[PDB]
């Protein structure tokens, strides 16, 4: 191998990883 800085995309980790969108949830999303 790895050269000089692979960058590392900032943000998109704090609950915004897209994975688990209303999967482990059974809240009141109903009338």
Give structural notes.
With 31 residues, this protein is low in regular secondary structure. Helices cover 0% and strands 0% of the residues. The chain has no helix or strand. It is rod-shaped and about 55 Å long. The PDB classes it as antibiotic. Keywords: antibiotic, thioester. It forms a monomeric assembly.
Query: Total helix count?
Result: 0
Distance between the termini: 56 Å
Helix content: under 10%
- What would you call the shape? rod-shaped
Q: Got a strand count?
A: 0
Structural class: little secondary structure
Report the sheet with the most strands, covering strand number, pairing sense and barrel closure: none
Q: State Rg.
A: 17 Å
Strand content bin: under 5%
Family: Belongs to the type A lantibiotic family.
Modified residues (D-lactate): 1
Protein name: Lantibiotic epilancin 15X
Cross-link (Beta-methyllanthionine (Thr-Cys)): 20-23, 22-25
Features:
little secondary structure, rod-shaped, antibiotic, 31 residues
List the helices and strands and how they pair.
Layout: no helix or strand
What can be said about this structure in brief?
This protein has 31 residues and is largely without helices or strands.
């Amino acid at each position: 191998x790895a050269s000089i800085v692979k960058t590392t995309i900032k943000a998109x980790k704090k609950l915004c990883r897209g994975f688990x969108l209303x999967c482990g949830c059974h809240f009141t999303g109903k009338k």
